[PDB]
Amino acid sequence: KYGENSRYFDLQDMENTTGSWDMYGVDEKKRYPDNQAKFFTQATDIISRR
Amino acid sequence: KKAQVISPVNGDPFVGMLETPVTSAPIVATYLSNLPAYRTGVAPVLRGVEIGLAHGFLLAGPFIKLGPLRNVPETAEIAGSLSAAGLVLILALCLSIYGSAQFQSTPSIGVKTLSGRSVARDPLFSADGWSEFAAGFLVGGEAGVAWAYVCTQILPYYS
Amino acid sequence: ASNKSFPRDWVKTDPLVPVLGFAGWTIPANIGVSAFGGQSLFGLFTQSIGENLAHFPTGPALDDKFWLYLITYHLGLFLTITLGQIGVQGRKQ
Amino acid sequence: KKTAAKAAAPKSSGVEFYGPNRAKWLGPYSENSTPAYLTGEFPGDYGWDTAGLSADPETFKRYRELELIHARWAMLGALGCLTPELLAKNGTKFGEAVWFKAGAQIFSEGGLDYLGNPSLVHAQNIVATLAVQVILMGLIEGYRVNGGPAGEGLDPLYPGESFDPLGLADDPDTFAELKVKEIKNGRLAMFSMFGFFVQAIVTGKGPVQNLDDHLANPTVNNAFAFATKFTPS
Amino acid sequence: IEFYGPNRAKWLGPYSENATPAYLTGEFPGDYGWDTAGLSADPETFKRYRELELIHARWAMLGALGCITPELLAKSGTQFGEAVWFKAGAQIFSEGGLDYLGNPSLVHAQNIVATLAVQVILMGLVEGYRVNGGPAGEGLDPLYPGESFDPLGLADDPDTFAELKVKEIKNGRLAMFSMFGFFVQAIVTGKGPIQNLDDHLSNPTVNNAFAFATKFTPS
Amino acid sequence: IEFYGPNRAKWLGPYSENATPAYLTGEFPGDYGWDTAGLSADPETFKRYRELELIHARWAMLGALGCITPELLAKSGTQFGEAVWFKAGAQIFSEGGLDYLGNPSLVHAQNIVATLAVQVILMGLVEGYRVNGGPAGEGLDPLYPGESFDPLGLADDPDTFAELKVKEIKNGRLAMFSMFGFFVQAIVTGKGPIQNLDDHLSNPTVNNAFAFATKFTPS
Ligand code: CLA
Ligand code: CLA
Ligand code: CLA
Ligand code: CLA
Ligand code: CLA
Ligand SMILES: CC1=C[C@H](O)CC(C)(C)[C@H]1/C=C/C(C)=C/C=C/C(C)=C/C=C/C=C(C)/C=C/C=C(C)/C=C/C1=C(C)C[C@H](O)CC1(C)C
Ligand SMILES: CC1=C[C@H](O)CC(C)(C)[C@H]1/C=C/C(C)=C/C=C/C(C)=C/C=C/C=C(C)/C=C/C=C(C)/C=C/C1=C(C)C[C@H](O)CC1(C)C
C-alpha cells in the first residue's frame, strides 16, 4: 500500500507513485445560476467549432 | 524543536515539488479552488465567457490611458476600446490554433486528487471542450471591452 | 522527514500576542521628550493623520514631515509584534 | 487543497466547535465545563448564559430563529448607512446623504432624486411606497415561514437551494466554518448599528462625520465631550 | 370559523404553516398560534399569561371606552371643561375641584390625596379579593369565576359562551392596540384623539401623519 | 419570624394565599413567594437569578451609601465643589481635575481616559476572578465563598449567618428601590436628593410631588 509507513512505489497504483495529482482541481456543479447555461450556450452555438 | 511547517507533497519526497505556506495554505487553497479555471464540473463555454469578461475589461484600460490618442478629448476612449477589442480577437485566434495543436493526439492515463480518490479527467482537455472554451473567450472578451466603453461613458467621477 | 502533510495551523494563534504587541508598544510610545517640544510619537502624527484626512482626496505632499512618522512608527510596531510571536516559548527557550 | 476529512460529527475546523472552543474570558470561562444545555454543535454558541433567558430547548431554537434574521438585517443596515456618506464626500450629489433625513427627501423638491440624477425612479408618493412595502414584505416573510416558489421551505434558518447562484453549499466542514463567519460579522453589524443609533441620539451628525471629527482630534472629539449633555437641571 | 380546533383562523391564514407549536392547539379562546419569540413555553407561565392577558384586556377595554365617551358627550350637548383625557386628571387642581359632568351639583372632589388614600384602600381590597376570592362567594376560578358576577345568566349554553370568550379576547387585543395608538397620539401630536378623528375626517390626505414627522428631530 | 420554612413572612401576609408556588419553599434567604409573572421557573435560571440579584443588591447598596454620604459630608463641615452626585462625574473637567475631598493634596485626577483604561483593566480582572475564583483561595462557591473575605469570623454560627443573609437581601432590595427613586428624582426634578430631603422637611405638604407634575407635558 502506498500511503503507509514509507512504503512508496505501489506498482498497480500508478497515479499516486508517479506524481499525477490534481493540485487545486475541485469538481462540482451549479457554479452558475441556471439559465446562463441557456443564454450563453445558445449564444456560442455558431462558433463552437474549429 | 519538534515543530515544522514545510513539508513534501503528500508525503513522497521524490516528486520535485515541496509544500509551503505559499502553495498549500488553507485560504490560498480554497481561493484557487474557487477560480473558474479549476472547477471541472461546469461546461467549458461558461468558463470561457467568465474568463473573457474579466480579461477584456482589464485589457481596455492601458490603451485608454497610455495610447497615442490619450490627450485628444472624448475620442481617447474610442481608440483605446477598439484596440483592446483587436487584442482580444487575436487572443481568440491563439486559443483556436492552440486547440488545433495540443489536443491533437491521445490524452494521458490517470489522475487522482490530493487526498486520494480517483477523480475523472477534466472535459476542458479535449478538442471539443477547448474549442468551445475558445468561443466562450471570444464572446466574453468582446462583451467585456464593450462594457468598458459603456462603463467609461456613464460613471460618477471617472477621470 | 520534515513532515508528511502540511499542517493547516502553522501560525499558532496565541490571542494575546497582538494585543500585547501594539498595546505594550504604544502605551510607551506616547511619553514626551525634550526632543519634540512636549509631543509624542503617537500623538504628534495623530495631528497629521487627521490633518490631511481633512482635505480628503488630495494625497498628502511628498515632503511633509509625517512620512517619517509613518515609517519610523511601523518600523517599531512590526518589530515588536514579530518578537512577540517568538514569545511562543512553548518548547524552545 | 485537501478534502477536509469529515467522517464524523464534531466540526473542529481550527479550534471552533467541540468541548475546547474559544470562550469569552481567557481564564474565567463558564463554570463546570460551560452550562449543560449548550456544548457546541451549532454556530454562535460562546457561553453568555448569565441571565439564562432561554433554558428550554424550544427557546434555544426560537431565539436563534430571531438571531440569524436580526443579524442579516443589520448587515445590510450597516452598509446601507455607510455608502452615500462616502459617495457624497467624493463626487456625487444626493440632496442629504445623512441618514436622518434620507427618508425626508420626498418632501424636499420633487420627490426622491436618485444619485443626483433627474432621469430615474422619482418616487413622489409615500403612500405607494407604504403599500409596496407592506404587500411585498408580507408576502416574502410569509414565504419565509411557509415556503413557496423559487425553492420550497425546508430549513427556516438556512434554505440553501436554487437561491444560491454560487452553489457553494456542498462541503459541510467549510460551512461549519462559514455559518460562524456569518454570526461573527452579524454581531459586528449589530454593534455598528448601535454606533449609528446612539451616536444618532447624542450628537445628530452622520457616523462617517463622527469618524472624521474624531480623527481630527481623538483626545477631544469623542464621547466624553457629550457627557455633560442630557443632565437633569 | 373553528377557533376551538385545528382549523382555527391562524396567524397568517393560508400562509398558515400548518406545523403549529404543539403546546397550544385550540381548547382556549384567542389561541392564534403567533409565537415568534416563544416567551410562554412553560405551561404554568402560559396560564399566568392567559390570566394576565385577560386582566390587561378588560382594563384596556374599560380605558378605551373611557377615552371615547366623555369627549363625544361634551362635544354633543354637555360641557366638562377639558373633556380631552389629558387635563381631565388635572381638573381637580384648576379652580373648584373635579366637578363631575361639569356640574357643581355632583362629585366636586377638592383634595386629590383623599381620592388617593381611599383609592389605594379600595383597590387593595378589590385586587386581593380578586386574587384569593371573598365576597359574593369564594373565588374558585382565577380565569372566569362563574359566581354572582353574571346576574343575567348568559353562561348556560357552552358554545355561545366560548364564542363570547373569543369575542372578549379579540376585543381586548383591539382595545390594547388602540390604547397604544391613543398613547402615541398623546406623545407625538399631543392633541385630542377625537379632535384627531374630526381633523382627519376633514383632512383625509393633506395632514395625514408626516406633517407631524419632523418634530422630535435631534440636533 | 420564620423565613426558613413554610411560615415565612409571605408577600401579602394574612392575605397569603397559602397555595404557594412549589419551586420555592424556604431554604433560601429572601424567598417571599411573590411570583406573579413567573420568569424564574427553571432551577438553573433561578440560581442565576439568585446570583444576579445578590450582585445587583450589593452594587446598589454600595451606590446608595455613595449617594447619601458625600452630600452630607460637604453640608456639615467640608467642601467638595458639586457634592451632589450629578456633576461629581464632571468634576474632572471643570478647572483642576477631580480633587478628592475638595482638597488639592489628594487624588487630583487630571485625565479621565487614564481612569478609564485602568478602571477597565482592574474591573475585568476583579470580575473575571469573581466568576472563576483566583487570589485569596480559589473560588469554590459562586454565591457566598466563605474564604478570606470575612476577616472577623462572623460566619461560624449558622442560624445567625442565615439571618444575616436575609438582612443582606432585604437591605439590597430596599437599596435597589431607593436608587430607582434617586434616578427618578434625577429625571423629574433634577436637583439634589438630599436637597429634596431638606426641602420636603421644610415643606411637608405645599411642594409635595405634583407641583413637579406638569413639566413633561407633550404639546
Ligand atoms: C518594455 C518596455 C516598454 C514599455 C513599458 C512601453 C510602454 C508604452 N509604449 Mg512602448 N515600446 C517599447 C517598449 C516599451 N513601451 C519598445 C521596445 C518599442 C520599440 C519596438 C516600443 C514602441 C512603441 C510604440 C511605437 C508605441 C509605444 C507606446 C507605448 C505606450 C502605450 C502602449 C500600450 O498601449 O500598452 C498596452 C498595454 C498593455 C499591454 C498592458 C499590459 C500590462 C499589464 C498592466 C500588466 C499588469 C501586471 C499585474 C501587476 C499582474 C498582477 C497579477 C495579480 C492580479 C494576480 C506605453 C507608455 C505607444 C504610445 O503611443 O506611447 C504613448 C506607441 O504608439 N511603444
Ligand atoms: C506593418 C505593420 C504594422 C502596421 C500597419 C501597424 C499599424 C498600427 N500600429 Mg503597430 N506595430 C507593428 C507593426 C505594425 N503596426 C509592430 C511590428 C510592432 C511591434 C514593434 C507594433 C507596435 C505597436 C504599438 C506598441 C502600438 C502600435 C499602434 C499602431 C496603430 C497606430 C495608429 C494610430 O495612430 O493609432 C490609432 C489606433 C486606432 C484607431 C485603433 C485601431 C484598432 C484596430 C486596428 C481596429 C480593430 C477593429 C475591431 C477590434 C474589430 C472588431 C471585432 C469584432 C469581433 C467586435 C496602427 C494600427 C498603436 C496602437 O494601435 O495601439 C493603441 C500602439 O500603441 N503598434
Ligand atoms: C435580538 C438579538 C438576539 C437574540 C434573540 C439572541 C439570543 C440568544 N443568544 Mg445572542 N447575541 C446577540 C443578540 C441576540 N442574541 C448579540 C448582538 C451578540 C453579540 C453580543 C450576541 C452574542 C451571543 C453569544 C456570544 C452567545 C449568545 C447566546 C444566545 C442564546 C442564549 C442567551 C440568551 O438568553 O439571550 C437572549 C437574548 C435576548 C432575550 C435579547 C435581549 C434584548 C434586550 C433588549 C436586552 C438587550 C439590551 C442590551 C443588553 C443593553 C445594552 C446594549 C449595548 C450592549 C449595545 C440565545 C439563543 C449564547 C448562545 O446560545 O449562542 C448562540 C451564546 O453563547 N449570544
Ligand atoms: C402585555 C400585553 C400582552 C401579553 C402579556 C400577551 C400575551 C400573549 N399573547 Mg398577545 N397581544 C397583545 C398583548 C399582549 N399579549 C396585543 C396588544 C396584541 C395586538 C397587537 C396581541 C396579539 C396577539 C396574537 C395575534 C397572538 C398573541 C398571543 C399571545 C400569547 C403568547 C405570546 C406570548 O408569550 O406573549 C408574551 C408577551 C409579553 C411578554 C409582553 C411583552 C411586551 C413588551 C413591552 C414588548 C412589546 C413591544 C412591542 C412589540 C412594540 C410595539 C407595541 C405595539 C405593537 C402595541 C400570550 C398569552 C398568541 C396566542 O397564542 O394567543 C393566546 C397569538 O397568536 N397575542
Ligand atoms: C433586576 C433586578 C431584580 C432581579 C433580577 C430580581 C430577581 C428576583 N426577585 Mg426581586 N426585587 C427587585 C429587583 C430584582 N429582583 C426589587 C428592586 C424589588 C423591590 C421592589 C424586588 C422585590 C421582590 C420580591 C418581594 C420578591 C422578589 C422575588 C424575586 C425572584 C423571583 C422573581 C423573578 O423571576 O424576578 C425576575 C426579575 C427580572 C427578570 C427583572 C426584570 C426587570 C425589568 C426591567 C422590569 C422591571 C420594571 C418595573 C416593574 C417597573 C417599576 C420599577 C420599580 C418598581 C423599581 C428573583 C430571584 C421573589 C422571590 O422569591 O424572591 C427570591 C419575591 O417574593 N423580588
Ligand atoms: C404577543 C407577543 C409575541 C411576540 O413573540 C413578542 C412580542 C411582540 C413582544 C409580544 C407582544 C407584546 C405586546 C404587543 C404587548 C402590548 C401590550 C399592550 C398594547 C398593552 C396595553 C395595555 C393598556 C392598558 C391596560 C390600558 C389601560 C387604560 C386605562 C386604565 C385608562 C385609564 C384612563 C381613562 C379610563 C380615561 C382617563 O381620562 C385617563 C386614563 C388614565 C387614560
Ligand atoms: C421581581 C419581579 C417579579 C415580577 O413577576 C415581574 C417584575 C415586576 C418585572 C419583577 C421586578 C423587577 C424589578 C422591579 C427590578 C428592579 C430592579 C432595580 C430597581 C435595580 C436597581 C439597580 C441599581 C443599581 C445596581 C445601582 C447601582 C448604583 C451605583 C453603582 C452607583 C454609582 C454612583 C455612586 C456610588 C455615586 C456617584 O456620585 C454616581 C453614581 C454612578 C450614581
From TrEMBL, chain B:
Record has Lyase as a keyword: no
Family affiliation: Belongs to the PsaL family.
Binding annotation for chlorophyll a 1: Y31, A37, H55
GO biological process terms on file: photosynthesis
Boundaries of the shown chain within the full protein: 38 to 196 of 196
Topology versus the membrane: Multi-pass membrane protein
Protein known as: Photosystem I reaction center subunit XI, chloroplastic
Keywords from the named record: Membrane, Photosynthesis, Photosystem I, Transmembrane, Transmembrane helix
Record-listed chlorophyll a 4 binding positions: E50
Subcellular localization: Membrane
Positions that bind chlorophyll a 3: A37, H55
Main location: membrane
Entry GO terms, CC: photosystem I reaction center
Domain Photosystem I PsaL reaction centre subunit XI as annotated: residue spans: 6-155
Binding annotation for chlorophyll a 2: Y31, H55
TrEMBL record, chain C:
Binding of chlorophyll a 1, residues: H74
Organism: Chlamydomonas reinhardtii (Chlamydomonas smithii)
Protein name in UniProt: Uncharacterized protein
Source organism superkingdom: Eukaryota
UniProtKB/TrEMBL annotation, chain D:
Location (main, coarse): plastid
Organism in which the protein naturally occurs: Chlamydomonas reinhardtii
GO molecular function: chlorophyll binding; metal ion binding
Amino acids binding chlorophyll a 5: H214, A223
Residues annotated as binding chlorophyll a 1: Y46, G47, W48, S54, E67, H70, Q105, L115, K181, E182, N185, R187, Q199, A223
Residues holding chlorophyll b 1: R72, V121, Q133, E141, G148, F230
Positions bound to chlorophyll b 2: T231
InterPro entries recorded: Chloro_AB-bd_pln, Chloroa_b-bind
GO terms for biological process, alphabetical: photosynthesis, light harvesting in photosystem I; response to light stimulus
Function: The light-harvesting complex (LHC) functions as a light receptor, it captures and delivers excitation energy to photosystems with which it is closely associated.
Protein name: Chlorophyll a-b binding protein, chloroplastic
From TrEMBL, chains E, F:
Binding site for chlorophyll a 3: H56
Residues that coordinate or bind chlorophyll b 6: T36, H56, E127, R130
Binding residues for chlorophyll b 2: W11, L12, Q119
Annotated binding of chlorophyll b 12, by residue: R58, W59, A136
Gene of this entry: LhcII-1.3
Binding-site residues for chlorophyll a 2, renumbered to this chain: Y49, H56
Record-listed chlorophyll b 8 binding positions: H56, E127, R130
Binding site for chlorophyll a 6: K170
Example of a GO cellular component annotation carried by this entry: photosystem I
The keyword ATP-binding appears for this protein: no
Residues binding chlorophyll b 9: E127, R130
Family: Belongs to the light-harvesting chlorophyll a/b-binding (LHC) protein family.
Protein name per its UniProtKB record: Chlorophyll a-b binding protein, chloroplastic
Binding-site list for chlorophyll b 3: W34, T36, E127, R130
Matching InterPro entries: Chloro_AB-bd_pln, Chloroa_b-bind
